[PDB]
Amino acid sequence: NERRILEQKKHYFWLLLQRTYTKTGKPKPSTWDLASKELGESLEYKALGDEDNIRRQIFEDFKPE
Numbered sequence: 001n002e003r004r005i006l007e008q009k010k011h012y013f014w015l016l017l018q019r020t021y022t023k024t025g026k027p028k029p030s031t032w033d034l035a036s037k038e039l040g041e042s043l044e045y046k047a048l049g050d051e052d053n054i055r056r057q058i059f060e061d062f063k064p065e
Helices: 002-020 032-039 052-062
Strands: none
Touching: 002 032, 002 052, 032 052
């Protein structure tokens, strides 16, 4: 069920990470360190506070466009 939730959040955090850092809007950070530093406020990145390694990993793998 958390697997089902994780996938839901996967898309929504990409929706969040894209909403913030889109194609042309904001460049997708070179490192998740600066990403999360600026990101920390939008609660969808708090949706993976217990699934940290997942969130860092998807962020990098997201790829805009």
